[PDB]
Amino acid sequence: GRPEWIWLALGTALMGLGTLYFLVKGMGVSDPDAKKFYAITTLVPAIAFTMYLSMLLGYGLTMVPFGGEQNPIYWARYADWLFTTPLLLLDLALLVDADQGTILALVGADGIMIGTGLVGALTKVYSYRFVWWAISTAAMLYILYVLFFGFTSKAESMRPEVASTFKVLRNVTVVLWSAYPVVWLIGSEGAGIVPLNIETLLFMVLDVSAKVGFGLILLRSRAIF
Numbered sequence: 243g244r245p246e247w248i249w250l251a252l253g254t255a256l257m258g259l260g261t262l263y264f265l266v267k268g269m270g271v272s273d274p275d276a277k278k279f280y281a282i283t284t285l286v287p288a289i290a291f292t293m294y295l296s297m298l299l300g301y302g303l304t305m306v307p308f309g310g311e312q313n314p315i316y317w318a319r320y321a322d323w324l325f326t327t328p329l330l331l332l333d334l335a336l337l338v339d340a341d342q343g344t345i346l347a348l349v350g351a352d353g354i355m356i357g358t359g360l361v362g363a364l365t366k367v368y369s370y371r372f373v374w375w376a377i378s379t380a381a382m383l384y385i386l387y388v389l390f391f392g393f394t395s396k397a398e399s400m401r402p403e404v405a406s407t408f409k410v411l412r413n414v415t416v417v418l419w420s421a422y423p424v425v426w427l428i429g430s431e432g433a434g435i436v437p438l439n440i441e442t443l444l445f446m447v448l449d450v451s452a453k454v455g456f457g458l459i460l461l462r463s464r465a466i467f
């Protein structure tokens with residue numbers, strides 16, 4: 243009680259460890275370009291650590307009635323994603339020098355995605371929950387589209403080591419971000435098929451992979467120097 247605590251505790255430890263490791267390596271780096279990438283990327287598990295710790299200690303949970311039951315909704319996920327998702331997008335954009343208006347579009351779409359996601363999580367009419375989910379996923383697909391088609395083109399003008407690293411991070415991102423709306427759909431926020439403990443496990447595996455896994459690939463590469 244609550245049964246999902248073990249995965250909130252594992253997530254906290256894993257985010258804290260990733261932050262600490264990225265900070266130790268970031269601090270010993272001279273290259274001014276490498277340093278931007280370390281600052282942005284160390285912020286990502288640090289924000290996630292804060293939100294995971296809060297949720298562990300029983301903050302950022304509300305009860306939302308829908309489907310004739312009172313449903314536990316962890317809303318602090320969205321305060322995390324609100325800030326961590328555009329920071330990961332920024333990493334990808336700095337790697338390919340996306341231009342200003344593309345970055346603005348993506349961050350903007352990203353806000354709509356996280357914001358409509360949150361509205362959907364808190365909606366009391368069961369059926370409109372899924373309307374919001376659909377707008378959120380469409381915003382997500384706009385992002386994946388730009389990452390796949392737009393950024394890949396931009397990265398092809400870079401040296402092969404940069405384009406290579408971009409491709410790996412682009413793939414990781416497409417595969418991991420894809421899964422989020424499915425988890426939400428089948429989990430405690432949507433259909434209610436996957437109970438909250440398994441769902442928390444899944445979001446934890448996705449978050450650690452999308453933040454720390456992502457960070458380890460980017461930060462160990464030659465492409466940020």
Ligand SMILES: CCC[C@@H](C)[C@H]1CC[C@H]2[C@@H]3[C@H](O)C[C@@H]4C[C@H](O)CC[C@]4(C)[C@H]3C[C@H](O)[C@]12C
Binds near residue numbers: 243244247298299300
């Ligand atoms: C007024 C008292 C409130 C306060 C002492 C309550 C509120 C939230 C509670 C923690 C979390 O549930 C997560 C863990 C669950 C495990 O089962 C036992 C340990 C664990 C860290 C808890 C300990 C403790 O019980 C806390 C801090």
Ligand SMILES: *C/C=C(C)/C=C/C=C(C)/C=C/C1=C(C)CCCC1(C)C
Binds near residue numbers: 323355359378419
């Ligand atoms: C560190 C966290 C990451 C990279 C999280 C990414 C989260 C998403 C891509 C979430 C997307 C969602 C939808 C596309 C629809 C329903 C609501 C969300 C927020 C789960």
Ligand SMILES: CCCCCCCCCCCCCCCC
Binds near residue numbers: 248251252254255
């Ligand atoms: C039966 C009660 C067990 C209490 C253990 C509480 C510690 C949880 C926070 C520490 C995070 C790192 C430990 C890895 C998860 C077990």
Ligand SMILES: CCCCCCCCCCCCCCCC
Binds near residue numbers: 384390
């Ligand atoms: C310029 C022609 C417009 C074509 C519009 C395509 C819109 C639908 C895309 C939704 C899915 C994109 C996923 C990206 C692959 C990772």
Ligand SMILES: CCCCCCCCCCCC
Binds near residue numbers: 265281285
């Ligand atoms: C304690 C966690 C610190 C991680 C943040 C480091 C990156 C922020 C740099 C801000 C601009 C110089």
Ligand SMILES: CCCCCCCCCCCC
Binds near residue numbers: 347
């Ligand atoms: C250059 C095109 C700008 C597009 C702005 C964001 C699009 C969001 C997707 C639709 C969500 C309902």
Ligand SMILES: CCCCCCCCCCCC
Binds near residue numbers: 440443447
């Ligand atoms: C990275 C965490 C390891 C994955 C855990 C395996 C799943 C079995 C647990 C079943 C739910 C209680």
Ligand SMILES: CCCCCCCCCC
Binds near residue numbers: 261262288292
């Ligand atoms: C290196 C870890 C930095 C994160 C500490 C922030 C704690 C604030 C909790 C509200």
Ligand SMILES: CCCCCCCCCC
Binds near residue numbers: 380381383384387
């Ligand atoms: C149904 C999903 C709509 C996503 C829009 C993506 C358009 C790509 C810009 C050309």
Ligand SMILES: CCCCCCCCCC
Binds near residue numbers: 413
């Ligand atoms: C070299 C590896 C490129 C493909 C990575 C795809 C794996 C997705 C992570 C789950």
Ligand SMILES: CCCCCCCCCC
Binds near residue numbers: 440
């Ligand atoms: C796609 C992952 C689905 C796994 C969870 C379903 C099992 C629910 C336990 C009753």
Ligand SMILES: CCCCCCCCCC
Binds near residue numbers: 451459462
């Ligand atoms: C999908 C999880 C990615 C794991 C990253 C760890 C590998 C770093 C060596 C390049």
Ligand SMILES: CCCCCCCCC
Binds near residue numbers: 347350
């Ligand atoms: C919502 C701001 C859009 C800025 C214009 C540039 C779009 C390029 C993809």
Ligand SMILES: CCCCCCCCC
Binds near residue numbers: 373
């Ligand atoms: C961004 C468009 C808003 C659509 C709102 C529809 C909600 C149904 C109650």
Ligand SMILES: CCCCCCCC
Binds near residue numbers: 444451
């Ligand atoms: C639940 C989606 C599958 C996770 C694949 C990544 C594991 C490292």
Ligand SMILES: CCCCCCC
């Ligand atoms: C404590 C194991 C991590 C190795 C990093 C280099 C010291």
